Symmetry: D3
Subunit: 150 residues, 6 copies
């Protein structure tokens, strides 16, 4: 369905580096529709829940501390296959291994400063969207450009 959604966060490094607009632009050019958007400084609570699946992993700590270190631009995008697509557009975890053309491939070098984060499955997307956004913050009236879908 063309109403699938995903959660993307331009991390503190992406924001500090002035990449918010560039990133949003990539998803707009693709045809995806912004249904949620805000800048905030994530609270430890938020980050911990966001990255709950990594509570164990040794890098969990610094990650939580990093995402809460400064402003982040949280976004929700809607469109057909947007979850998988946005990940393809982001690249892979390691920016050095990300293909040119992808966001990490074009802009990053370090795993811990990998610019943006995106939901890895519809299940996770739904969970993270609910986490970062109040329902009234998400559009209900979505208007994709009439030339994008059959």
């Amino acid at each position: 369905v063309n109403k699938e959604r995903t959660f993307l966060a331009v991390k503190p490094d992406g924001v500090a580096r002035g990449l918010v607009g560039e990133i949003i632009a990539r998803y707009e050019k693709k045809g995806f529709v912004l249904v949620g958007l805000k800048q905030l400084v994530p609270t430890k609570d938020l980050a911990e829940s966001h990255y709950a699946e990594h509570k164990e992993r040794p890098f969990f700590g610094g990650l939580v501390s990093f995402i809460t270190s400064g402003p982040v631009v949280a976004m929700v995008f809607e469109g057909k296959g947007v979850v998988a697509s946005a990940r393809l557009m982001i690249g892979v975890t390691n920016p050095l291994a990300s293909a040119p053309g992808s966001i990490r491939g074009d802009f990053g070098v370090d795993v811990g400063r990998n610019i943006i984060g995106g939901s890895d499955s519809v299940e996770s997307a739904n969970r993270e969207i609910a986490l970062w956004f109040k329902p009234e913050e998400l559009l209900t009236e979505v208007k994709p450009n009439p030339n994008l879908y059959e």
Copy 2:
């Protein structure tokens, strides 16, 4: 000082046209810092208050109707002379008269579909920021970039 702030809004046409990232990128590249950001569908009240100075102008009804017809991406940018600079970057009210290089100049043709709106003075900016953003949505921590400011 370098703490001046202005209110900018990508209107429904700018949003429908996928110009959000492009616009945000222009202000990021300029060196202004994003201190507030959110997408929302304006209410009649918000819209009428935002444009209160024009309540007796003939175009007011259509303007309020249009600004409330879809999502708007509201933002606040901070930096030296940001209010006058943002206006220069936007162009003039009529996009056809706006210079190539300005946002309306590069992207618009109709006064009623002029893509973005920005505060016209520090006074208007203070009033507009207050209308659209709660204090808690605006960053307080803004370390000036040593690369942008002497």
Copy 3:
């Protein structure tokens, strides 16, 4: 030979979305030479001979009606290995599976609105070029650029 040619069409969706220049620019930047160009609204017969290989397939009907639904910008580009290179630049049939960096990968989300079409072999290209352009509409003189070719 450096005079290979391929047929590319910015489909009705690509034209309506204002992607004609962006697409042409990618081929110009690559070093391919525009030897034919025109905008037209395809007739049913043209569309049908163009997609003749799919006349028995289920999506054929919807494809032909779509191609004829609005203007198309038909082009012929010349250069070494332009047929296969132009396809690599386009992506794969499904824009969602097309890599960031490719035309469909950067701009599309639906197989039926996949922006551009390109010949898939030298044979198909010669055939398609003959279908869309009269000889007089194609450049005959193309001195290879010494900066692009040994």
Copy 4:
């Protein structure tokens, strides 16, 4: 009216320099609609009727020979005030005096290789369009985009 039209030609230098897509993209992004497009090598008669107003001027001869020296991409764009707007987007006769942001300002350095030509009045445009395009080569159906026009 929103149906005003103007004639623009990417001159032989603009075409040879691979600026066709970049130029078209600027007009598409602005919101103007491509209603006519084709690449051709101008005949002496065409060039001469096109620049008829300069037939008595000294540079006329060199101008006509240049316009006919290689392919040109002729275009017709439609929209509110497109004639004057398209000229503002082009710059002024001398690219060196053309403002950054304009086509000549960004890409040229010589009056005789000034990249693109555009009609300078509605009268001239209608005349020029009739010179370069047969009616059948121009779109008749142009429903204004609701995002570009009130």
Copy 5:
């Protein structure tokens, strides 16, 4: 003459901010030819001579100290009217007053962090070129794209 030259320096702020390529690209797109290029950390001696005309002015000190604070990319560009043109492309001293489309207008906010510096006259250009570059560092064989000049 098409062999006029000018000296441009991407200052430490321009380099620190990752604007070297963007700036060089603007001059290449314009048609100007790079005849000298190098990155170095300016010595006080160099900066003082470079900015000799301001030895008096109160801002002289900090300026010298700023240009010597980090790497700078020194460049020499050749083309018709390149001295005046490059200044027009740079903007005015104050980035806030520089027009969008110009380098300072697009990227800066502070007079002391104004990204790039360019010769203000052929006389000064010649002096600065001689100052920053050894004759053997400057091209003698200059090849402008044959489509730029009459």
Copy 6:
């Protein structure tokens, strides 16, 4: 470590084509730091030493002739995994086989005119940097960007 360096060279075709800024910008945007930069016309000796590994290859003579036929912009970039990353960003030897998004993929069509050259290993990089740059031309002071490196 994050101090790895690689040698990159915009070949004469890349320079003639005005691709210098674009290429430098790609590496700047990626987060790699420019530690050396200069434009020069290679000598037969430099060229033969640079490509010594290919001295018995059939294409060696034409390659040496071409690389010495005009200016080259030589550069050294520093950062984690810069050598392999730079290669990924360049593409593969044959531009036609290089992926959209890579430099050769976006801009080239001929193996002999493949725009840029980059070290293929840390060993080759150390050798190449030493060939083209004196120690005094390479920055020694490189404070890692806190935004790019954990």
